[PDB]
Design a protein around this ligand. Sequence first.
Ligand SMILES: *[C@@H]1O[C@H](CO)[C@@H](O)[C@H](O)[C@H]1NC(C)=O
Lengths: 48, 48
Amino acid sequence: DLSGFTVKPVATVHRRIPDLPDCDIDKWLNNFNVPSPLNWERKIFSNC
Amino acid sequence: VGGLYEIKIPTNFTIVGQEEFIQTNSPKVTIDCSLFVCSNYAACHDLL
Ligand SMILES: *[C@@H]1O[C@H](CO)[C@@H](O)[C@H](O)[C@H]1NC(C)=O
């Protein structure tokens, strides 16, 4: 009984939601009004 | 009672059937240890 094979994939399926906006993460990180550790700020990025 | 004992002797009879299954075999299980432990993954086959 030889070692098990698996059928090779004949194609690739790639799916992503199209036309989503850019997240602009650099614009928020480069904002010059920087908070201290006491009042550390959060931003949430989704659908981008 | 004197020399004699009381015994129940059959006066009529029938034949009865009884089934008995005896196991003599079992499912021949076989394992590919490599396919079970690692599936398709080359990084696992290397470590295995
Ligand atoms: C023996 O038993 C069977 C079933 O009960 C019956 O048909 C038959 O007549 C009986 N015979 C005697 C001699 O008792």
